[PDB]
Amino acid sequence: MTLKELLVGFGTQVRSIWMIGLHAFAKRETRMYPEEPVYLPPRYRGRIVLTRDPDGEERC
């Protein structure tokens, strides 16, 4: 191939290598389940329950 695009490609490979090397020093985005408890929003749709009224009986 043409030497110009070869040199540009080599420089771009060096740029990608350097960007991953800079990423090596960043902070981790890992949420450490199960040691870190997973935060869930209050209206998240998970395990289904049947609740009770403030008197104490079952609401259903």
């Binding site: 695009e5 540009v8 490609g9 771009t12 490979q13 740029r15 990608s16 960007m19 991953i20 990423h23 985005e29 869930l40 929003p41 209050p42 209206r43 998240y44 749709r45």
Partner: protein
């Protein structure tokens, strides 16, 4: 109007999620590995906002006939502002790290090319139709759900 703006918000959020997954999977198909991890971190930010809004990640089932299921929770603007501050630097980083690599360009440029006639005669729409120069987006040609206001 508020229903239209809410549905536009969630549709655009899921569009960003789908586009992030698509770009990361294409980059992984070319051969680079890190952008799929980074784009899935961004997808987790999106999923945090969507979990706050609806209560689910992938299939919220939140739109209704005549509106949406619930109202917006007290404090969604903080999460949206955090996501909008988080995105563009990472998107530029993705472009610089993988989408400007000349090996990726050699793998992807000029591969499986077709003109506007092949896109029209096969019914291809979306980015495959707009890459032929045919400016046909449904959000601008046949507007819906308050997309004119944006």
């Amino acid at each position: 109007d508020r229903v239209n703006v809410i549905r536009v918000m969630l549709s655009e959020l899921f569009r960003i999620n789908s586009h992030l997954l698509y770009i990361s999977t294409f980059i992984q198909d070319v051969g680079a590995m890190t952008p799929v991890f980074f784009a899935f971190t961004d997808r987790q930010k999106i999923y945090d906002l969507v979990e706050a809004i609806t209560g689910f990640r992938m299939h919220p089932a939140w739109f209704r006939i005549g509106g949406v299921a619930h109202d917006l929770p007290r404090g969604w603007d903080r999460l949206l502002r955090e996501f909008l501050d988080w995105m563009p630097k990472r998107l530029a980083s993705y472009e610089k790290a993988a989408l400007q690599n000349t090996i990726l360009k050699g793998r992807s440029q000029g591969v499986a090319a077709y003109g506007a006639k092949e896109a029209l005669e096969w019914g291809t729409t979306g980015a495959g139709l707009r890459a032929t120069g045919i400016d046909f987006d449904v959000r601008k040609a046949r507007p819906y759900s308050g997309y004119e206001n944006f």
